[PDB]
Amino acid sequence: AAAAAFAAAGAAAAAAA
Amino acid sequence: GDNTKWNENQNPRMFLAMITYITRNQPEWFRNVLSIAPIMFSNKMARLGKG
Amino acid sequence: EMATKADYTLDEESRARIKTRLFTIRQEMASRGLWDSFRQSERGEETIEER
RNA sequence: AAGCGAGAAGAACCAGAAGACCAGGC
């Protein structure tokens, strides 16, 4: 179903705490 | 060009000045840790060798 | 004492010995008067700056 | 697209008056 063709960068985020 | 007598002329007191400037506003302990080496080198001694 | 699913996996006498030892240390510490002191435990006094 | 040394959590952690009287606003 929902899929990412090509994901660059490290991803995630430190804002969530 | 190369620099003639580069190693012989790079005084360690200038390295201390560069470190102190670079470590401006840093915690005093960090300044100490970075500045100790130039201090010791400025007071270094050279062994002669075998003889 | 109390455990998961009410299973202690020990003979009654062994658990009795453990509970008696706990009670004895409790009474000795109370004799020392710090029972209320043991009732206090702070989160953390972590302020060790790197010097 | 980037890409030049390693991590994870022992122990255990609230308070009443009530009654009378007086002054006072509405």
CSV table of N, CA and C in Angstrom, one decimal, chain B residues 23 26-36, chain C residues 49-51:
chain,number,residue,atom,x,y,z
B,23,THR,N,38.9,29.1,22.5
B,23,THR,CA,38.2,28.7,23.7
B,23,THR,C,37.5,29.9,24.5
B,26,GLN,N,34.1,29.5,26.5
B,26,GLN,CA,33.9,28.1,26.8
B,26,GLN,C,34.1,27.9,28.3
B,27,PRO,N,33.6,26.8,28.9
B,27,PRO,CA,33.8,26.5,30.3
B,27,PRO,C,35.3,26.5,30.6
B,28,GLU,N,35.6,27.0,31.8
B,28,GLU,CA,37.0,27.2,32.2
B,28,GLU,C,37.8,25.9,32.1
B,29,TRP,N,37.2,24.8,32.5
B,29,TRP,CA,37.8,23.5,32.5
B,29,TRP,C,38.2,23.1,31.1
B,30,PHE,N,37.3,23.4,30.1
B,30,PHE,CA,37.7,23.1,28.7
B,30,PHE,C,38.9,24.0,28.3
B,31,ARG,N,38.9,25.3,28.6
B,31,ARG,CA,40.0,26.1,28.3
B,31,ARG,C,41.3,25.5,28.9
B,32,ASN,N,41.2,25.0,30.1
B,32,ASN,CA,42.4,24.4,30.8
B,32,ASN,C,42.9,23.2,30.0
B,33,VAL,N,41.9,22.3,29.6
B,33,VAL,CA,42.3,21.1,29.0
B,33,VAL,C,43.0,21.4,27.6
B,34,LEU,N,42.5,22.4,26.9
B,34,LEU,CA,43.0,22.7,25.6
B,34,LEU,C,44.3,23.5,25.7
B,35,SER,N,44.5,24.3,26.8
B,35,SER,CA,45.7,25.2,26.9
B,35,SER,C,46.9,24.5,27.6
B,36,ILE,N,46.7,23.4,28.2
B,36,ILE,CA,47.8,22.7,29.0
B,36,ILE,C,48.9,22.4,28.0
C,49,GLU,N,29.7,19.1,38.3
C,49,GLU,CA,30.2,19.8,37.1
C,49,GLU,C,31.6,19.3,36.9
C,50,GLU,N,32.0,19.2,35.6
C,50,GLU,CA,33.4,18.8,35.3
C,50,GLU,C,34.4,19.9,35.6
C,51,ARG,N,35.3,19.7,36.6
C,51,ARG,CA,36.2,20.7,37.0
C,51,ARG,C,37.6,20.1,36.6
